[model samples]
Target: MKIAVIGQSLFGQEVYKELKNEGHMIVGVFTIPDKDGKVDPLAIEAEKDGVPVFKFPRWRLKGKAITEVVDQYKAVGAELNVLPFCSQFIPMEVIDHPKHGSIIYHPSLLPRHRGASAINWTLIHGDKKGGFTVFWADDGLDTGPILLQRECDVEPNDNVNSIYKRFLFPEGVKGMVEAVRLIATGKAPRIKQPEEGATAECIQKKENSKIDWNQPAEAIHNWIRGNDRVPGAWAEIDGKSVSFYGSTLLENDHFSSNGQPLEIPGASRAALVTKNGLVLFGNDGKMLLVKNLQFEDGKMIPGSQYFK
Candidate 1:
């Protein structure tokens, strides 16, 4: 099958590799423009393999597809458009031009977590299960028919990096390969997403990551881990704003070491920067352990040193 991989990042690069390794003809690679003098890995790989690479800033301008760009896309003669991790919104002209249409790789089960930050929201909302979906790309936001789905467990200690790098990333690469093979073999099924469990959310950002100390330890823990290493779950402390990452929930009010109540450091009532982590006390007296913290746009510091 002659296909164009319309995506960027390591995930997109890996997907292109697997498809090529499977002996498919990759007609083109459509990825985002280089930033900060750094080229996207997918573009780099495609160039090395001699596949035509298109680095369009966007497929559209002023809410319409660019003519020259669309002409170049048509020149690729791609039978399918495989989107593994596309950040740019593709125009319908390119999407529907290919015979097999376009298939997108989303980080969550379709109809649920139906937008960017799907992985973040999976942990933020404390979902027990996590999954990824490959679906037929349409104009609507993730409102597409599913081609394939894969499931995994949402571990208690899982963060965005932990969960994605550990399971979703590796498994998702395999899923993309499987989906492409199915399509090429003419056996892929387009299952319309069910409406009952559908959910859509905005992209997670610093504004969405503000922490409320009044929330329960479990929810706070989830919030911190969900935004871990990205926007970070932040809170105002001592009139200074700090973001939290790598956390755990302690359902108890006090820490016990060898059956003895450990002495908490500092005079702060809301947060204690202990040797182990930055311990935050919720309104209900429960505690949350933040292993890492940082000031806005500052270097990450160990939790024990963040407050001091």
Candidate 2:
């Protein structure tokens, strides 16, 4: 099958490698422009194999598709389009141009968590079941028909890095390849997503990643772990900002703080730095243990060293 891959990052690179290793004909690659004097791995990998790599800043401009991009895309003559981790808003001219149309790898089940930050939101909202979907993309944002989906457990202490590195990225690569293989074999099915479970969310940012001590211990832990190593769940300490990561929480009767006893009535607003991590009390009187901490826009350090 002649395929055009439109995506960026290591995910795109791995997808190309897998498809090529499986003996598919790679017609071309479309990725974002170089950043900070470095090229995207997808573009680099494509160039290595002499595959045409298009680094067009965007597929559209001023509410219209770019003519040059469309012209070059026509030359590829791709039978299928595969988007593994694309961020750019690809024009439908190119999306629907391929004979087999475009299939995208999203980090969540379709008709639910239908946005870029699905994985982040999944943990933030404390959803126990997390998964990925390979879908036939339409004009809408992540509102595509499902070709295939794979599920994984959202472990108690899991974070964005933990889930993606362990399941979504690795499993998703196989899912994308499996999708392409199905398309070539004429067995690909486009199952329309159910509207009952459909939902979309905005991108996660610093404003959305704040620790609220007034919430239950589990909710605070969820917020911390979900935004771990990304926007980072943060709080103010002694008039300085700090982001938290590698957190955990379990409801127990014996809850205590660093400088306070287990029977203390007031939940101290300040953090309790301990040998393992930082502990904080929630409104429910339970404590959440966070293993990593970082100052505002600063290097991540162990919670033990925060006060030292």
Candidate 3:
């Protein structure tokens, strides 16, 4: 199968490599243009493999599709279009140009978290299970029929970075390869997602990442885990804005200082300590143990060393 790969991230590079290793001929590679003349990693890899590469700043504008882009794909006689981590909105004409149409990779189970930040949203909502979906592309956002799905457990200690690096990232590569194989063999199933349970959410914003100390300890823990090292779960502390990274949940008696930082016992370091761990009082008399944190102008460090 001659596959056309359209994407721009590390995931894109992995998918392209996987397909190439599976002995599929990559017809052409499409990626976003390099910013400030910096070559995209995916484009560099494609060029190394001698695959024809196309870089477009914007494939569509003002409801007008780029004819040249569409013509290029058609010229290559591409049989399948695979989008691993593409961010652009693909026009239907270009999408339907290939014989097998197109297949897209979404980081979440379809009909849920149907946007760019599916992974982040999944952890933010404290979902026990999260996974990736490879589905046939349609005109709607992640509303297409599923071709393959892989689920993974969301551990209590798992963060956005940990989950992707450990499970979804590797599984997604395998899933794409299997999906392509199924499609090539004409055995892929297009399972329609139920409309009743479908939900869509926009990308999480910086404002939404702000941590309210008054919220439940579990909620705060989820926020910290969800944002992890990306957008970061932030809070205003001691006249400085700080983001927390690794954390643990501890339920214990309430402290009287409200959200003030306190010194930990026998740790030889000053920290916000509660009965359970590093303390932050919640509205429900719960506590949260923030193990690692980063300040707006400082690097991330362990809570024991942060105060020093």
Candidate 4:
């Protein structure tokens, strides 16, 4: 089938290549215009393939420039336009013109995680399973009928990076390819999503990224784990802001021993316990854990250094 690929990121490159390898005619590629005028991986790949690549400064662009681009793709007689990680609102003009319409590859199961940072939200909420969905595009965010769905179990110790690298990325490639093949073979079916089970969340913003010491240790751990290496989740100590990584939650009671608070033995590889064990206020109650962190200073070490 003749296809137009609109995508971004490393995942987009994967989809573009896979579709090309499947013998689909990749007539054109549309990707995010360089942010602040910087080259992105998608543009790099498009250049290598010698495919015509269009850069929409933003998805909201309208009028003749946008209409002309859509018409050009349609004129090529491409049946399908697949968006893999195209982080922009595709105008209805483009979606409605293609013979096969357009299909989007979302990182999360639809109706559940509809917006950005699906993997991070999944981890923060303690979801045991993580997956991807290939759905027909719609005006509403991720509010389309599901064409394909696949789920993977999140391990007890899995973090955002681990789950995404081990499952989300690989599953996305396989799932999206299957979705395209199904549509090409006339076997794809659009199933309405259960509206009652639907939920939507915007991308994690700065407020959500701050660590609240008043919350439970387990919850805090989850938040930190969710943020992981990217957009690092942060906390404040000694009036200085610090981000945490490689941390864990420990169960503990709320009572302070004789009014003495938890003490840090100073930054090191291991945790330190004062006469009173580590004092952590959690959502439900107090919790404890050794600080395993990567500090703002070029070096990563134990949380204790920041404590003293």
lDDT of each: 0.86, 0.87, 0.82, 0.73
Cα lDDT of model 3 overall? 0.82
- How many clashing residue pairs appear in each of the predictions shown? 0, 1, 0, 6
Local accuracy of candidate 1 as per-residue lDDT tens digits, 5-40: 999999999999999999999999988889959999
User: 1-308 in candidate 3: lDDT tens per residue?
Assistant: 99999998889999999899999999899998888578888899999999999987777888888888677767878899999999888989888988899999998987888988899889888988899999999998889999998999999878889999998999999999999999989999999987886778777666788875555668778878898877888776566677777777764444434433663332222346333335554556566677776776787766656546
State the lDDT at 248 in candidate 3: 72
- lDDT per residue for candidate 2 within 202-298, as digits (tens), equals 8888887776767888888898998987889887765677788999984554544443222212335555677777777777767888888888767
> How does candidate 2 score on lDDT?
0.87
Which 10-residue span in candidate 2 carries the lowest summed lDDT? 258-267
RMSD values for the candidates in order, in angstroms, are 3.3, 2.7, 4.4, 4.9
- The superposed Cα distance between candidate 2 and the true structure at residue 35, in angstroms, equals 1.0
The predicted structure with the larger TM-score, 2 or 4, is 2
Candidate 3 regions with alpha-carbon error over 4 angstroms: 252-278
TM-score of structure candidate 3? 0.89
> Candidate 4 lDDT, tens digit per residue, 66-103?
65656665666668889989877778777877788899
Runs in model 1 lying further than 4 Å from the true structure: 256-269
**Pairs in steric clash, model 4:** 215-282, 215-283, 216-282, 216-283, 267-304, 267-305
